[PDB]
Amino acid sequence: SELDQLRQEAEQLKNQIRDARKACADATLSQITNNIDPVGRIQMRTRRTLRGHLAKIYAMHWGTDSRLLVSASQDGKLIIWDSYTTNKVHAIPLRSSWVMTCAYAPSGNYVACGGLDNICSIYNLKTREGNVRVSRELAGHTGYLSCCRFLDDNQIVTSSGDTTCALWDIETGQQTTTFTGHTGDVMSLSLAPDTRLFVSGACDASAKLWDVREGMCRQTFTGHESDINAICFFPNGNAFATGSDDATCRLFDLRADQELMTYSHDNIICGITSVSFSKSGRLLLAGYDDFNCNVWDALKADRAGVLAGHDNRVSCLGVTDDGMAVATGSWDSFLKIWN
Amino acid sequence: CTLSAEDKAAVERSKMIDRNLREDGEKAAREVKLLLLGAGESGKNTIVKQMKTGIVETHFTFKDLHFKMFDVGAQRSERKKWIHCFEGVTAIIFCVALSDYDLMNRMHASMKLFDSICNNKWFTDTSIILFLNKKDLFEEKIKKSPLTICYPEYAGSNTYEEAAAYIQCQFEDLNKRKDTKEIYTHFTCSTDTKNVQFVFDAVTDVIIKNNLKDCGLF
Amino acid sequence: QLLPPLYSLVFVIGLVGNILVVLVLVQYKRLKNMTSIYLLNLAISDLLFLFTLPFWIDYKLKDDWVFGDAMCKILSGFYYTGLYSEIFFIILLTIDRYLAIVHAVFALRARTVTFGVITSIIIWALAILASMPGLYFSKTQWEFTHHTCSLHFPHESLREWKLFQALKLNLFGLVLPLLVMIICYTGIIKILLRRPNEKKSKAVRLIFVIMIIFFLFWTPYNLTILISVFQDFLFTHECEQSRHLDLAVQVTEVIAYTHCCVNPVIYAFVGERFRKYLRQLFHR
């Protein structure tokens, strides 16, 4: 009786939450932004092509200076590229070939890499012996790592395939905080501009907004009908966008607690692998399984451009901190910079 | 040539990196990489010890071939999320315990897992090496408790030579892609010295088929 | 004018086929291996040989060589270099497939880009040296009626030279390639038939088709060249049947140009991966 009574109480709370959300909604985003001028066709040409990877490229991250970038591929290689001269600054050989994520520290001193070995390795790029060396091996997870991001040079947050997020301490090497509450394994995370909060999307079709300091889940969003593979904050920090296997993107808001726009098309029936915003927050880059990338405008969900020129799945996608270039990786082992 | 001296030294370093990348990526394409799979209490542990917290990579060599097996057991996450990483392995090695028909039951779970992987969209052409292990005590587990407990449609004799063949044909079904891949099968025992020669012959056949598709005879 | 419509058809068909093969091999670099390098060079050899067709077509109708000695010393080299090169590449593709199927494990280390390139260069050098007599003895001489571009040898050495060219063409055009294919393919069929399958049955039929086409197309050319070398000993009167022996030479020349057009079909188009790449290329 107690279990079913708690279940009915939970259902009543969910119903009152739904009623509050429905009472807050008074005018959809598509009704206020029907008067603003639309953007034309976004023609973007390929400027560079970083061709040194042999296997499938699974992750890429831009440096903060907007010139260097790290890429990870399952030939067991972590390559630091110079995007202006196309020069290979570094090539790091990994112990485990099965990687799924890589991060560039906002200082530029460290590179993180994680995969199917349940370990997040931290590599030092600025030693005095000349070569890059593995500094730390954060090993406390029980499922594969799907994302990792530096808060600073000493704190990193990692999402794993065991439904748990974890905030670590590079120096000591232990989990400072453990975020739990997801039921499906988490596939991506995204820090806010100010690093107080961060969202994470899981295979249970939910996106949870955690607070880094208190260690608690603040809000939960459910609008998708399948696994969520990509997530990214709006540049403002008061919204974000998710991309799932149901071939849609969705724009959730944090202060209204409900979604605002859905980016979908009839001709698109493939899942999204990656998503990223522009610098102004107007454009929305979404990489797909149909070998293409698409460019929406968030204020009115009509497709404004297409980035074609990859011969396999677009696995990773990143915008530079200046807003100058867009890097896209793929399973055909080529990175491409667009502008 | 619009490049300073430091820029030229940077380009020289980048190209010296490229040379090592090519050497490594051409040494990698000479190793055979097999993906181990199976259910609980199977023969995966045993076959690893006979041939040689996340993925366990085992390396060994046989007759000028270098194999690396990726035992991905214990990755208790959503398999539909990390299995495309293995699209492009030479062969799968699927272990099934023959004694687990009496102890739905374990054999039906193994058959469901085999049907799940053998028809995956990432393994539409990858060969499968079925290892039906633990036949030594399966030979005596059928003297009592006839096979009808697991398969109610069995009408043959309770002899080992026929029940084992019936199980083998029940497993070599479920292969809806009978034209792109082949299912190799072996009846091994805990004390068996020919378990690596069979996988060698199977991967030799897979290599020969890939070479026939490459040269153009297919 | 029976020869020109036939010559125009072989010239266009073969040129279109070789260009398609080169585009697919170059565009899809990711498939850079020994098979691709040899196949790229076979397409080149055929293009160089087919290249000589407009000069022959136009010349026959005109019946007056409109070109210079140097033009002639180049065209004769292209025609002979082309024949030796394509035949030597067919010998290398045959060997490459031998290693790939038979001794498949060994081949993982033996079949590389480096060796394919070095080997291709050596064959081209041999094809060029083999056609060197033709480059040297090419002399266009103006008869009062018209200009004829042809090979000329010291009269005292003419019989020796007529035979020399015939033996190079017979030995490295028919005997050596036929022997290589018989040994190499016997060793492939014995592997293909070890395990029964529908795709294995198709591979065996394709192998027989390749061996038979090569044989039938090259057997008349070499035999006709040998007959010409011995007109005095093979006919009661010199040139007694020149009306049938010249017609035969012209027919066997058309057969040789046709064997160039068939080379892309039996070495590239039949392969599955190649057809798939062409379909993608056509939509890009």
Next chain:
Amino acid sequence: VQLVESGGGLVQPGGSRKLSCSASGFAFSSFGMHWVRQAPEKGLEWVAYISSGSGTIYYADTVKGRFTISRDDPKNTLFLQMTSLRSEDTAMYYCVRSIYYYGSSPFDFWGQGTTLTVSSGSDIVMTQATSSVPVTPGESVSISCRSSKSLLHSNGNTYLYWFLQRPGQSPQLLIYRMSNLASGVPDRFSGSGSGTAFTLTISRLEAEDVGVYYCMQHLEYPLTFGAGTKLEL
């Protein structure tokens, strides 16, 4: 990280000698090496350079065809074979490592050097308009230099390095481009400049920063140091 040079000694003119330099404690194979020398009482001058993997070699045009620099990667030593030693090739020889990628620090570690004594046009000239500057601790100094042509490349860089040699030791990298402080160097030194005129400002001195401040350009070869500026008292 250390470099130990050996050889040296007394040589008669026209002889020969092989200077060795054993490296220890860093990835030797990924570093290019330079041989620099310093006369008994003069400044620094660049002698030879061998890149990473031995793919590029440069000389100073004062020793070209007479010296031979060669690196051994397995045995970490670096060799300089010198033949036909004239009377101008008498100096202390330093080995200096240098690595070149985007954002690196070339010339970051100088060896100890070995003494060699022998008995009996389009280059860039680095002009340091000073030879000695008197100063007391706590004050701020501004050393200055100027070049023959603009050291500012088209790619935005300005290839000007500031070194420092303390009495009885080897030079030390202070600034490794116009306004780029090296690692391990206190934050008192600050580089600045524009075009052909450059300045090194020290906010407050100490007892461990008096000595000879040199300069160097890396825009073209050969590498030309300026004459030192001595800070005493």
Next chain:
Amino acid sequence: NTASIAQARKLVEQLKMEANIDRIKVSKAAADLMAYCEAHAKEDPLLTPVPASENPFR
């Protein structure tokens, strides 16, 4: 089941902590997103392409 009872208690406590938050209307959040997208228009090279002079990738 005690484990499931504790699970349901934690779940209902989380839902209670989540239900009592302050929410603004969608009109205001939409107006704020639109204002932020309009205030940073000219500083976006991907939206309005920069001349080939200051394009670091030309």
